[PDB]
């Protein structure tokens, strides 16, 4: 009786229509384990003794004539179930399935990062509690956590009488999430933000914080599900998952065991048939993402779900790394045509950018090789990046800036601009993004060195048109204008300054000069010494007249002046003045060392310059025999000046990451030192798994 | 048998020397790599070479306790002072301590909020060492011996 | 777009050929590591060579349904049959079928009476590609084309 | 006063004596989260409104006169608390408790392999409920699940009679788990056990199954804690986490997130201070193991706990490998250098053995190098292992043999004998274990080749006295007699037969002749062909006259006989007749191939023969010019006979790792191979890092 099957399946599945999305795996809880719903929509006969309603249902789906004889109401129910299963991704029986396809259709505005449209929708009116729930999640993603909390409270106050269990559950969970996040954020403000931001940010006043602290004290979320009516818990066993304090509990363990199985496969080099471990964990990842974003769960902003997606996406990416060069064996490739390789699309880009922290992305780069995979949907990624860049420009330009949104957003924007190394962008979008990066990214969360290296990363797939060099000119001119003040200095976290901006422009535009820098230099005076010292770095960016004036107004009688002059090519050789000056500086440091022996050995600060002098001695740059007198500090000094006398057990492997290929070629050619470095490299690679050492060994195959 | 390096970190302002907070260190990373221009894009000449390599240092702490006066009084620069004790392989329990400190450390945390659920306390304050045109890097090593 | 290797396996007794159970293949490890004597302990001479490398081909199946006759009737050799729709890169669509079988097999299930507390169905059965001194490994592959 | 705090803590820790051990982390729930009992025992303050909660008790411990001021009853209470805190391994206060000694804890005897002692205790008359509870755990560990179920039900009856809640709880959970064991055991028996041996075992009569289903039904353990007096809930809150079928709910996700932290530390190269992540993982591991063993809970012989301990020990060993291979900087060395290596003691050995599978031990050896980490507590490992060997010997000696014990324990014995490669063992214990391994091990679980390679692994470190050689010889004799029946075929899961046992004997012992084989040779006749085959395989282990008899009885006739002949040194150089046979076999393969070209081609058995013929052709062993007539049928063949024409897109990773020293030398000798092989090798290693590939690249090719 097909009518009985339609009635049964409708009674089981129709109440789930209220949810915007239903997880595939969790469907098994709906029928009380009568069936097994695999993640790819295939569905496998579970231990049961039923009429087999699903086989008959798919039979009606395949045959039009079979469904043509159904009654009107039963046919409408079948149509509703058809569109539901198509939306979720349930396809057909496991046996009947011979070839299926996956998809990626996360349909949340909050997911996409189109903050302008989110704000527009927030401005628009509302007609349904679903719209208010959407707006609450949107505001929380936009950082207005006071407004979001108030709107969530309003949602609860409406839902208690609207008689909608799902919306009441989801809003309760999300209000608890916004309370937890606002409490943690204000604690971070009170404690650290004074020290970090340099000011006492208090977006939430004390009275409102006390209000939320007192409003729902002793609110145990683990009893929330139990506290709901019988119908909801009976028919929403799917939603037991979230109600725990530790949401992502079972799914975290399942991801752990799937990770274990995937790592076992990688170690063994085993071949997986049917649905691989990677496919199932990927589908579960995407199911969770769609579930929480389409249903608008604020829990996605927490460290629990951030870590969950980080682990899932990492697992997919490292598995793809393995599969790009996996064991062939002549049999695996023969079973299926071509390969279902992993390519990073827009949704994967959003996942990695938002849900990772920057250190996590650096981890992925160190472990995997993201430049070697293929990217798709470049238009969508360009839209995402333009949204990000124009958002930061619009907000940070204005004195007004929701600081809590800044905390919830700067991670995402940082990660997006950091991970856009592998994407192609239009000249318009590239120009706007670099302008935002160079001007309106705040100094507190992005310093000069990080700014330069991130720009340099952004200019990988696309070279520099005239617009980019123009905007860099504008930024550097602004920095020069601001550098007049005697109580202002450049601090770099990475260790790269505006001289690297100039080097970037001059490398990407050999014939280039700036009239703004030339005219700001032409009106300089000896009183403003710091500005002269700063503009000394940007010499090739000046005109001939400005160059002559700058040379006349100041000499290079200094060590930093010496380094800046050699770096931008002012001096091709070291004059007696320069070698005398560095000898004097090393003498004063040596007497400081002699005085400090009793107080303790200190060599970290100038060691950069000791290493530089040692390499210069190695490279026939310094031709004075006095240099030998100051052997005794092991900071890459003896390494270069007297490699024979250096104690190699004090060698650090990380000293080979910094040397350029010219110096690597030179050090590769020495017969008094090569053996120790090569054996250290070979045992390091044998005992370690870093690709940079592979690259060095390739340069030192000798 | 456990590691006898339970270091204590003092976070003091650089301008005058006021203590900001005391804590016990949790993790500390030295990063040493080049991204100047491309993997090989340094500027130079046949007879010229400049070690433009840049080093970024990061730190973090645990058991972070703020001072009453610093919280009461509320281009800033700050310093961190390590406090450990030496323990040579040849000689154990070396009375001579070991001092490390970064005169210029930026309290720019890679983490922003770390929104958790559980009632777990782990306030890790992630710093990073800065630099200047006058000094390439700021940290200092010193031992009582 | 999915891995189009959804398969069905048929387990039969080698002496006669009665169907024992049917399932769908899950994975198939193909390992080859030298484990004779020590890492380097093979026997040989100046002109003497023998490839002593030994392949172990472990496989696995899921959703195992046994036969009513086999359950009713109750050096026993057993065999396996594996079938799958074949595919080509140029043309995934492929009439031809890939035939895989393991005439000599052990039902050496690594389950070992596992005891997962959850009420989750998983009739996982692991094979071990047995052999004999006459034939190194008993498997077969033939495409229908 | 001190009386107040002593009374309060004694009231709070009075019912906590009954458990033979309690996890330090689990003590937090006793104090209502007032303190934070770190895994190291340091008690870091977390929340307190009063004073002297634990600092006063620590002061009483420190000051003897303060203890003197206490009353007599308070004095006894303080002594009891002192005993409790020294047994649990809990320090009295973190404030003063800084650095501390980390030493492995203690456990009960069921953890150890004292099976004879377990029987001895079972035979004795019980004293109290605790004695019989330990006895039930002993029987269940001894695989007498019928008796374990019966006696667990008995002690549950005794507990409800006496109203001792703890034993009631522990015996109820243990009986539910033994019921799960019985149910899944009969299921897997009826499913596969008939298929693995030939006849299905019925250790439990259908009446017993019906009885255990009927007596308790619809019993989910999730409500077990809820269905207890409020006194139990208040006092033994520590036992709340045991009452969930999804056991290891918390420990699993905690292990996952600490693995993520450890992996982040690994990828970053960071250095940790204080107690690391790996240290806390190890102490959590030991806490939970001691909690489940010292208390004698049946949940340790189950897959969830086995995988939990598997992942724990695996993580600890990867971290040990990392710290062993971690690069040290001068700054890091100044902060900390020459760290102590990872300790791998008896308790960890039993943990690995009991809770690992063979494939996971393989995975661990593939990932981490366990040879490098030293092993401690050799005598205790020897005693445990020898006890395991004695127990399996006595189990398979008696006609009576518990199938359930066999199944539940054979995994542990298999893994123990597998992992005993690294440990040093006494000669008497070596005799005992090798006797157990060879004579009294089954074929349902351990096949012949796996048994050989495990014997070799045990031979790897602890070498073999002559008792072991005699044992192996007698095992070969037993196999010889077994091969009389013309029905049993020799098999091997790893492609290793009795010939490999003989090879091990001949390799370790230079010269060795078996008298028993020489005797059994003289009686056989022409009719028993397979016995002649088996003795031909074991030919290098019997007297000269017996060898002459076997030589006269048969000679080389087919390809297999030839390959075995070169495999045991009978034939030194191929003769004209041998090559005539080899071309004849190649003709047979060629005509087979041409006939089957309508269908596909198969080379899994024939691939060995064809590949080996190709190898022999490479090193000029075969001078026949007709060899080049069979090109273009097998990838290995074409590669080795005609490398020039072999397009290098069918190259196989298995060959790229499955090599020989002289094979690789010859490959490197030829440039035609060298270009393509080094190209694929460097591509493989740069794209994916593997120890074997890197070793091959850096040892032979360069």
Automatic annotation (TrEMBL), chains B, C:
It comes from the Bacteria. This is Uncharacterized protein.
